[PDB]
Design a protein around this ligand. Sequence first.
Ligand SMILES: *SCC1=CC(C)(C)N(O)C1(C)C
Length: 164
Amino acid sequence: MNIFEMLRIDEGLRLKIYKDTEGYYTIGIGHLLTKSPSLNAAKSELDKAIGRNTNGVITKDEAEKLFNQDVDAAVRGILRNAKLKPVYDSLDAVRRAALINMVFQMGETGVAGFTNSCRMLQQKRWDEAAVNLAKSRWYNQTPNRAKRVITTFRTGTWDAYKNL
Ligand SMILES: *SCC1=CC(C)(C)N(O)C1(C)C
């Protein structure tokens, strides 16, 4: 298991524009196109992202290319955030993947709260952090996924993704 396999499990793979859990146009492996209600706006974002006139459908290779860019972007976003970098640096590789997973799903920029959760992770109070992370819109809206990510933070193992 690694961050790519983990997110692939959590995000799925769809080659045609579809709506994510929040109702937003998305494609590939969790690649958010726009929060705009306009499908045309979403298709324009897609064409720009891929570099060709697609009309809503991409190939698996193209989906994996956006995925590589998105994971890279989540990692660089973490390292450029003065608040997240110290937490990421304090974690082992498995928990670092859990943090990348959260950033991939909700972004670094524009994310409200979680200051206390991050403080508990940096303190390595795994059980307390796990409880705290669950008191969130994030957990309530996508509980099965949040549970897997939280279990990863609580245990530092891939148990939530094995046999899954
Ligand atoms: S460690 C929890 C956390 C803090 C903040 C910077 C708000 N984030 O985006 C996540 C959800 C990673």
